[PDB]
């Protein structure tokens, strides 16, 4: 993807993270586990939901065909009518299919961007108190217990304390 995170420097997603689209995994002496980042997840749900509704809404005013009959000596205008009806169906079919292709691309990139930003938000907190491993993970120089871990997810990781 454009932002390099999803199936990039983060090789794959987590079956184990059930309660959000993006989040954290921690490992220390007390144990390990997953925690969803509520804020970025909810921003994603709002964006995708607005997108879908926006797509539905824009296509609500669109061509509707009507029955018209013509006799054996009105073939020209019958043909005109047919070509008009078909022409608009082809235009709207094109519009729908293209919008879906284009916005699917944007949606996948959006998720990649949200992951990348979450990774940077954490990177900018830890700074030099952790080794950036290259795979989505940061290895701490100090012992980081569960409340230490919570503070990293908080946005509160007291850098000067370590």
């Amino acid at each position: 993807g454009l932002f390099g995170a999803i199936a990039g420097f983060i090789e794959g997603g987590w079956q184990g993270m059930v309660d959000g689209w993006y989040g954290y995994h921690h490992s220390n002496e007390q144990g390990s586990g997953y925690a969803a980042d509520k804020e970025s997840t909810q921003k994603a749900i709002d964006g995708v939901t607005n997108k879908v509704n926006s797509i539905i809404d824009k296509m609500n005013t669109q061509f509707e065909a009507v029955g018209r009959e013509f006799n054996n000596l009105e073939r020209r205008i019958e043909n005109l009518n047919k070509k008009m009806e078909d022409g608009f169906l082809d235009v709207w079919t094109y519009n729908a299919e293209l919008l879906v292709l284009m916005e699917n691309e944007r949606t996948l990139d959006f998720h990649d961007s949200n992951v990348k930003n979450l990774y940077d938000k954490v990177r900018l907190q830890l700074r030099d108190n952790a080794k950036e491993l290259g795979n989505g993970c940061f290895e701490f120089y100090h012992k980081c217990d569960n409340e230490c871990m919570e503070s990293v997810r908080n946005g509160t990781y007291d850098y000067p304390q370590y």
């Binding site: 199936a7 983060i10 689209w21 989040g23 490992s27 018209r68 998720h111 954490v122 990293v152």
Partner: protein
């Protein structure tokens, strides 16, 4: 000790397309195209359609004896007509401005038939022998029930001068016609007078029809032809007939009581005993999708028609293998 950043995966096999990549597996997706229907013709929000079955609009309106089912039809939501109904014009001929009339019906939900010129009120002409083997009813020669085929009485056809006045509040659909006989002998045999006409007048209309003699092919056993005409008689306006032969006179006309959204649907299907908010010529639609691909000609509150086989939006993210 480490903390990792990551994203969701699941067992989903749902796929979406993009410009640069097809068949991308995603954690979540949303289909937006309705592909199914019930395959039936249904009531539209409770209101049953007019299903002409084997009758055409002409057979119904003129009163083809085979179309007695539709002698007094209630209010309809839409109309359903086959592609080639068998019961059209039993006696061969033409229906003038037929397509413009059918278009007029797409704005009509209810007719109320009324009598404007009683059959018995033809005192100087024979009005009960205007029948043909082409329009049989119960094995006997009959005729279009809404118009009277008048012929000579005691060897004379005196000039007809009738007038009807639209006193009722609703626009009136008046139908009449003219008989084109096979030869000069048939003309005198039925109508005495060799040269005849039918003149019709309203506020707007100024018509004069003359019969057209010609050797013609037999159609449903008949050499003669019937050419039918129509008009919309405004309120407080009078239609004025004058003729000395070949006149197919109106008996019953239709009041236009309900105007509104309707359509003539072409379909071979019969009634489904069913209800729906959206109907197509091949079946009804019940879904919340913004799109469908069943058929372009719909009636009701419908999704938008597209010619796609597949429209699926990604909501989630690229799923891992």
């Amino acid at each position: 000790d480490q903390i990792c950043i990551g994203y969701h995966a699941n067992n989903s096999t749902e796929q979406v397309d993009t410009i640069m990549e097809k068949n991308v597996t995603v954690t979540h997706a949303q289909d937006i195209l309705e592909k199914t229907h019930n395959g039936k013709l249904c009531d539209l929000d409770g209101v049953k359609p007019l299903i002409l079955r084997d009758c055409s609009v002409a057979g119904w309106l003129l009163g083809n004896p085979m179309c007695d089912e539709f002698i007094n039809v209630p209010e309809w939501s839409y109309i359903v007509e086959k592609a080639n109904p068998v019961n059209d014009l039993c006696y061969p001929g033409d229906f003038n401005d037929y397509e413009e009339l059918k278009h007029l019906l797409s704005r009509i939900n209810h007719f109320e038939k009324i009598q404007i010129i009683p059959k018995s009120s033809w005192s100087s002409h024979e009005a009960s022998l205007g029948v043909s083997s082409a329009c049989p009813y119960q094995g006997k020669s009959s005729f279009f029930r809404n118009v009277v085929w008048l012929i000579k009485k005691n060897s004379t056809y005196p000039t007809i001068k009738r007038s009807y006045n639209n006193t009722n509040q609703e626009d009136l659909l008046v139908l009449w016609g003219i008989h084109h006989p096979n030869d000069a002998a048939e003309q005198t045999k039925l109508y005495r007078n060799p040269t005849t006409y039918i003149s019709v007048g309203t506020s707007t209309l100024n018509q004069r029809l003359v019969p057209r003699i010609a050797t013609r092919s037999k159609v449903n056993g008949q050499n003669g032809r019937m050419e039918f005409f129509w008009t919309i008689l405004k309120p407080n306006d009078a239609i004025n007939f004058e003729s000395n032969g070949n006149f197919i006179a109106p008996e019953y006309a239709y009041k236009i009581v309900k105007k509104g959204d309707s359509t003539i649907m072409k379909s071979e299907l019969e009634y489904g005993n069913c209800n729906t908010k959206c109907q197509t010529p091949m079946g009804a639609i019940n879904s919340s999708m913004p799109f469908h691909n069943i058929h372009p000609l719909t009636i009701g509150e419908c999704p938008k028609y597209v010619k796609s086989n597949r429209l699926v939006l990604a909501t989630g993210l690229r799923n891992s293998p």
